[PDB]
Structures are given as C-alpha cells and as structure tokens.
Amino acid sequence: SHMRVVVLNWDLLEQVLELGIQPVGAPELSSYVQWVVQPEVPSSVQDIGTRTEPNLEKIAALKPDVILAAGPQQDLLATLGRIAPVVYLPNFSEQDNAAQVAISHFKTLATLFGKEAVAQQKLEAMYARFSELKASLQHAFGDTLPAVVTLRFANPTSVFLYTENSTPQYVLEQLGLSSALPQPPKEWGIVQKRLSELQHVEQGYVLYFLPFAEEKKVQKSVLWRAMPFVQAGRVNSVRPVWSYGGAMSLRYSAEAITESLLAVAP
Amino acid sequence: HMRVVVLNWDLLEQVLELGIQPVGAPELSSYVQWVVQPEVPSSVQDIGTRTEPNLEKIAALKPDVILAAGPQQDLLATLGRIAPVVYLPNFSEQDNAAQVAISHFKTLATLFGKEAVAQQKLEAMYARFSELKASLQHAFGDTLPAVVTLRFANPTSVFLYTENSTPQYVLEQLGLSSALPQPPKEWGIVQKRLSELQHVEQGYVLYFLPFAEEKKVQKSVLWRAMPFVQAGRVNSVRPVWSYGGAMSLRYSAEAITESLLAVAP
Amino acid sequence: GSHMRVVVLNWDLLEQVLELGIQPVGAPELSSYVQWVVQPEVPSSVQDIGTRTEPNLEKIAALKPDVILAAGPQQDLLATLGRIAPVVYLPNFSEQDNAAQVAISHFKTLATLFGKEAVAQQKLEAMYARFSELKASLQHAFGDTLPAVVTLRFANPTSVFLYTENSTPQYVLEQLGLSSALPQPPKEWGIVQKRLSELQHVEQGYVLYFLPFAEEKKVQKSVLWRAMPFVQAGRVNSVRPVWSYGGAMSLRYSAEAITESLLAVAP
Amino acid sequence: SHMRVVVLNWDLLEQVLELGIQPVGAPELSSYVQWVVQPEVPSSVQDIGTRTEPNLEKIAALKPDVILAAGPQQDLLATLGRIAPVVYLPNFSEQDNAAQVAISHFKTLATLFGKEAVAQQKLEAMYARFSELKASLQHAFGDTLPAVVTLRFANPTSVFLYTENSTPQYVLEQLGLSSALPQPPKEWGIVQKRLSELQHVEQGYVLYFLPFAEEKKVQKSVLWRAMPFVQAGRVNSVRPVWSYGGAMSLRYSAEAITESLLAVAP
DSSP states (O other): OOOOEEEOSHHHHHHHHHTTOOOSEESOHHHHHHHTOSSOOOSSOEEOBOSSSBOHHHHHHTOOSEEEEOGGGGGGHHHHTTTSOEEEOOOOOSSOOTHHHHHHHHHHHHHHHTTHHHHHHHHHHHHHHHHHHHHHHHHHHOSSOOEEEEEEEEETTEEEEEOTTSHHHHHHHHTTOEESSOOOOOGGGEEEEEGGGGGGOOSSEEEEESOOTTHHHHHTSHHHHTOHHHHTTOEEEEOOOOTTOOHHHHHHHHHHHHHHHHTTOO | OOOEEEOSHHHHHHHHHTTOOOSEESOHHHHHHHTOSSOOOSSOEEOBOSSSBOHHHHHHTOOSEEEEOGGGGGGHHHHTTTSOEEEOOOOOSSOOTHHHHHHHHHHHHHHTTOHHHHHHHHHHHHHHHHHHHHHHHTTTOSSOOEEEEEEEEETTEEEEEOTTSHHHHHHHHTTOEESSOOOOOGGGEEEEEGGGGGSOOSSEEEEESOOTTHHHHHTSTTTTTSHHHHTTOEEEEOOOOTTOOSHHHHHHHHHHHHHHHTTOO | OOOOOEEEOSHHHHHHHHHTTOOOSEESOHHHHHHHTOSSOOOSSSEEOBOSSSBOHHHHHHTOOSEEEEEGGGGGGHHHHTTTSOEEEEOOOSSSSOTHHHHHHHHHHHHHHTTOHHHHHHHHHHHHHHHHHHHHHHHSSSOSSOOBEEEEEEEETTEEEEEOTTSHHHHHHHHTTOBOSSOOOOOGGGEEEEEGGGGGSOOSSEEEEESOOTTHHHHHTSHHHHTOHHHHTTOEEEEOOOOTTOOHHHHHHHHHHHHHHHHTTOO | OOOOEEEOSHHHHHHHHHTTOOOSEESOHHHHHHHTOSSOOOSSOEEOBOSSSBOHHHHHHTOOSEEEEOGGGGGGHHHHHTTSOEEEOOOOOSSOOTHHHHHHHHHHHHHHHSOHHHHHHHHHHHHHHHHHHHHHHHTTTTTSOOEEEEEEEEETTEEEEEOTTSHHHHHHHHTTOEESSOOOOOGGGEEEEEGGGGGSOOSSEEEEESOOTTHHHHHTSHHHHTOHHHHTTOEEEEOOOOTTOOHHHHHHHHHHHHHHHHTTOO
C-alpha cells in the first residue's frame, strides 16, 4: 500500500520510483541527477545521506515503515533494524547476472507494494522496446551488427570495462550487438584495465558512459588520439545512464546505447 | 570413488583422463564442440558454465571435493563452504601452460591415487610425440617447416599463440619451427589483425576448429591474397582445446601433425 | 661443478648472479652499487673490477675468471673479453625489449647455466605471489579504482626521467593493477627525458620518484615543484632505492618499494 | 637442464655433440659430413645457414635458449643477443694454443650444460688413447719416432702448413712425433706457403688432410712427384679430421694421423 519507504541505494531508488511508489528518503539526491538521471526523483524525497554512510539520525526522523537496502548496505542491516524493518535486496555480485537480478527484484518489490500490475506493464514494454532498437540497429548496419565495447573511465589512464554479468552486457545482447572485448564476471560487472590496453581494439566500436569530469583531458591526450577506434571514428559518448541500476535501467541504457551507436554509423 | 565436481574444462579433462568420473562439470554442451577429445560421460551433470558456475546445483550434488582453476579463483572462498576445494591454476603470463598442465595432472593423480595410470599415459604421450616427429620428417624433413598456430577471432582478427602457450610447446616437441613467435601473455594468446599474416611468406599456417565464420574467411577478399594461402601451405586442425590439460598436449600434437601431413609436398 | 669463477660487468647481471646464490670474483662499481641498487647486498669477497662502461681488462684477467658475464653496455668489448675467458652476453634494455620479462628470462637462463634452477623457480614463485599480495593491499586502502601512478627518476632539478611502457617500473605498476598516469611509448632503458614542467598536468594522479637523488631537498623547496598539483594534494612520495634497470628480483624489491611508498600518502 | 642450443661454428658443434648435447640448429650440415664427419650430426638438427653468415630468421624461429658463437661470428654477437643469450667461445688466435683452448672450452661448455662427468671421462680416455697410439707408433718406427709435416692443400701450387699453435701440431707432440717443418704461431694455426717450399723437407714425413678435390691433379703433377718425401715413399693421406674442431678433435686427428703414418712405414 502507501507505506513510508526509505531506500539506501540508487538501484532501489529507481525500482521503487518506477513502480509508482514515492519514497520519503533516498541517498545522494544531488549526485543522482548527474549519474543516474533517468528516473527523476520527486521534490518530496529528502536526502538521507550517502549509500555507504547513511544518516541514521535523519532516516529515523522520517518515520519509515520499511528500509530498502542493497549490496553496499549489507553491514548495516542489523543497525538499520533498530529503526525500522529492513528489506534487503542485494545485487551485482560475481555470481549475480545483475540485469536478471534487477528484474527479479523489480517483480518482488512490486508484489510487496501492491504495484504488481504496473510492473508487468513496464517490463513487457521494455522487452518490446529492446527489439525496437535492435530492428533500428540492423537497419543502419546491415543484419550483421558490429561488436561493441562499453566502458567507464576510471582515471585519465585507466578504464572500467564491463564484464559478461554486467547490465551493459545484457543490453548489448538484447540489441543483437557483439562483445568486442569480453570479460569474465566480476563484482559490479566491471574490470579495471589500463587505457593503453585499448590500443589493440582495432575492430569494434567503443562507447563510454557519461558523466566523466576529465573527458577533455583524456581526449587531449596523445594516447587517446592514437587509439584505432578514435581515428577510425568508431567511438562515441553514451548519455548518462546508471550502469548499476534497476529493471528500467536496462531500458534506459538500451535507448542510450542505441542512440549513441546509431550515430557514428557508416 | 570420491564425488568430484570440476569447474573448468582443463581439470575436467585431467580428472577424466585419470579414469575418474566427476558428478559435475561446466558447459557440457559447449564441451563437445571445442575440446571434444576426452569425451565427457553421460553420467556427469552440467553444473553451469565455467566462468559462472551454479552453486545451488553443485551443493545439490553433495561433492566431497571441488576442483577449481584460474577463472574460479574469486569463488574459492564460497566453494569451501560447500566442499573442500582443490585450486589448480594455470595459463597465466608466467605459467608455461604445458608443464603446469602436466604437473597438475601428476598432482591430481596422487591425490586420487591414480598415480600409475597417469605415468602410463605420460610415457605414451612422450613416445607419441617422437612418433609424430618421425612421420613429419618422412614427409617434410629433415628440415621441418616453420608453423603458425592460431584461432580466428573474427574474419579480420586472429589469436596467435605465444611462447608460453601449449601449441608453442607442441610445435617444439614435433621439431617444428615457430614461424611467428610471440612474447608470453595470459592464456598464451595475442589478438592480431589478419593483415599481420601478409609477411609470413615462407612457412605453414594452421587454425584450430571450430570456427563459425570459416566459410566466410576462406573465400574472403583479404585471406585469399595471403602468401601461405596461395602457396597452399594452410590447413584446418581438428577441434583440440588449446587451453586444456596434460593429454591436451597429445591430442593437439596428433591433431596438428595429421592436419599438417596433408598439404605437404 | 658450478663452483665457478664468475666476473659480471653490469649491475643487473650482478644482481641476477647474487640472487641465484652465485658469488662472483669481480663486479663493477661496488662502491656506487650500495647507493643505487642496494637491495642484493654485494659480498665482501667480490672485487671491484672498474666501471660498467669502462671495465679494467687488466684486473678482470688477473682474477682468472672461468666465465665473464657481459650485458648491453659492454657489447663493444665482447670480442676482446673472449680472449680472457668465455663470455656470456645478456642484453636487456633496447626499445623493443620488455625489460622485466627478459630479465626473468635471463634469470632463468643464468640459473640453468649455473645449475641453480631450483632456487630460481623458488624465487620467481615467491615474487609472483608477493605481487598479488601487494596488489591486494593496494585495492585495500584505495577504492575499487586503483590509482594512477607516475614513476620517474630525477635527472636534474628541472628535468625528469619518465618510465615508458616497456620499462621495469611500468611492469611493476601493471602487476599491481595500477595505471600509468603518464604513459610513454617504449624507449631504450625504458626512459624518456621530460622537462619538470611535464608534471604540471598530472593533477589527480600520484607521482613517485626513485632514490637516491642528491638534490631532492633542493627540488622540494623549489618554486615549481611546490606548485605541482600532486604535491599540494599530498599525493607524492619517495621510493626507497631500487634499481630500475636490474634483474628479475629487482621487480620484487621495486614492487614492495613502490607499494610501501604508495600505501603512505593514501586516503 | 635440457636447453635449446644453437651452435654457429663447427668446433662448437662438435664440443656440444660430444657432451651428449643435441643442438636444434647448426651451420653447414651438408659440408660438415664432408670435412668434420667424425662427430656425426643427428638427423633432427636443422641447417641454420653457413658459418660467418648464419640465417637469423631461422635461428630465431628455432626459439633457442642459447646461441654458441665462436671467432668468425664475433661481429654478430650484438645481433645474436637480441635473439637469445649468447655464449661466446673464441679460439684459434695467434695467442691461443688452439688445443688447450679447445679443451678448456670443452670443460666450460660441460660445466654450463651439466654434462660435466661425460667430459672428464672422454678427455681422460683421449689422453690414454694418445699413449696407445704412441706405443703402436713406436712398435713400427724403432721407438725413435720420425719427424712429420702436417698440411692441407690450398691449391695445386700452394699449401697450408700448420704452425706451432695449431691443433695437428699438438697431436704430433702427444704422439711423440717430431716437427719436420715447424712454423711460428699464426691465426688458425696455419701458414700459406708455395708447394715448391716442400722441396726442402727431405728426410721426413708429409701428411695432408682430406678432402681435396684436386688430389689426383697434384698426385700426377710433375712437381709433387719430384718431392723427396714422395720418392722416398714417406707421404700419405690422412682421413678427414677437422683441424679446427674441439677437444675430441684432438683424439680423432691422433688416430687419423697414426693410422695414416702406420702406413708408409718401413
């Protein structure tokens, strides 16, 4: 029903908002509109601190009926229980297929909040949306879709490649895109490799998620300009979509990758 | 008869080659396509994939031991709560692949008491090596050609095998020269462009099967212009896992030799 | 037996030989050695046979060696040295050499030649294992994002020797999972001489410089160095003396040296 | 223990083979079985080109762990080191006593490759063989062994006399034979004199090493038949033994000279 929900992670914040549920508390709302962006966070929701170090004084003042915690708040579950009952929905382990798990959590949250019908409408619409971008991608590339590298910059010299169990990997598979640089499953679906290792990617297309404060710095480097995919024009920037989000995150990133990959096409 | 669960294809071969039949093994469907040679019995159940094994299934089999390799190193802690784990890593940039695959074959033998069976196979392997070398010298020799061993990534990229790889080891055991040596790397491979094979004029090029885009590459525009292709010094090696166990060295030796005995003068 | 009379002419080979349990009768610049290489302590018995660039042929021949180990910088003397004793030529720092890998490959080759193969494998396995520990200690104290590090040696108070992609400090950084923070294309000896002004744009990364450097205090109090972003942010430290152009065990000593100096000035 | 060795000179090829070591590459294998012949090169060993001018492409293709170079390859040491570690064992200078150096190199190579025991056994067997041949030589020459000239034909008009620092000279001394025409130490242990100079070796023996493609031409020539040692019947042909080989070369040349000198005896 209409309970007073406090989420402590950005993926759960998205999931709850997407279900038509409006929480009373959520972490890092200022950074949220820069990194996650896609599921706009209403004016009512108060910033209860960070995902790693939530404000216990503040969440208790909001009088929650439930506290939704994910992976990074697992050491606080006992602590959070002193304030209100906790529903722990973890994700993005080395074992979790992130995306699949994000959907199963999306369904579970729906049943608990009675918004079970709304969940089904969005999920089937997302699956239909996948094929829509896939169709628009083969119509622009010719039924042999290219191989794509999805990453986020770690430092101006280091890069987070997304692994096989990550959500961008799931998106690539749903779009019919190939994995230009596959990686074994890891936590959060990422692997930190050096940027110089991308000197050998002479074949596919490389997409990097926004924001990155030092984008110009890397772009102005001798190393980045020497990249095969850069001079060949097979590289673009994906509009800000949280790669560690919820179920609808898969959709938003699907529309974001496709839009950024329909560009820089032959 | 212990209840063994292997989580990697090399260990699966090693354990099977010792006459031991595990209760769990990864990617059994894909196994009969890429490694194929040590045929996995009908009894063994698919416990998921290599990189991403299913803990629920492995725990449901109630194993007495779990054999994990390199790609499962981040799961070792979790697996120990299911059953005692034997961690046998291999194919790093520092590992000589072949020796380590043999030493692991020996270690697995002693742990499982099948010490005699292991030695018998190893003696048969070394003997088979010299056998193939002789048959190569009777078809090429006494000056054996230089050979490139690779796997296709895509019709434009190629996985060349490095100095620490198992195909490199096989070539040296057959007395064959390395037509395109490479510095040590992880899993023993380097991904190069197909265009790099434009200057390997004198010698032989072998590529391992399967490759879904073989049909595309053989009649492809870039590949037919290759020197070793026009000279007819190129053939396809029957599917043998280049990242396997000890007996992989034998199977790949017999596979390369048989595929190289063809297209000979 | 392998109880042989070895004369080394380069510091890396001196290290390789000492680490294998072999004690040479001659080695170059022993006085300067304990200041720059330091780590593999040179025994009291081994005599100083001159420098690396200009070895004393009269002295090395007087020691009556059974074998002479010469490296890259002594290649122009190989023909003359064979007249004294059989020579083993082990190069290791061109722009195409992966320095570290070959230093290990030379460590293995030298081991087999001197029969010290078992100790070599033991040393290498202990080094490789130590790498993962240091990497582990680095992902701890730091985020899920290993930092970007610049490794260099001071040439003068205004110029710096940055290490390239084929250098041994670079190999160490890569084994630790660290980024290059200022990568450079492969060059001879693994270095490039840049102006100190090149460190003006390494803002969010880390800068480490190897010891010794006689004018570090001079640079520390200099106007340009204090204006450096990594200096004001406190992300800069001095690495304890480890030879950047050494042998296989040089990689281990330099890995522990970099990690410890980078565990400091960490968040 | 079992390394991949590539030798670039015939002497080093012999030394390594006598130690039970089997190289993967060796120079001039076709000509080797014509000039050196005794330490038979296995079928497995591949021809890496000629001496002085080795095939770098082939040597690198064999993936050697060591490259054994001698005198004539001294200008290639820098290039060879770029392929694999090089062990440079020079010999046959004006200062080298060839034979001693050939043995000391045989020992060092033995120590380096661990086949040290086999070396001492062979060397000790060689010294013992010397006295055996000397005895069979003294029983046929009246215990006062004659003076012998050892040479190789350059052309039908010139002859390569072997000097005091050469390996056949060492052989003559170990057999107790005198030097019927000694020469001051020179490079490769040889001196090129005109054939007309052998007119003065009257009261001695002359031995020439095989092969020589124009032996019949010289044998029926007017100048050679007019030689004092020829008319006196004190001349014979020594079976092919490499005068610039290794330690066991000294043995092979000892039994070859003795066998060729047991003939033409009174």
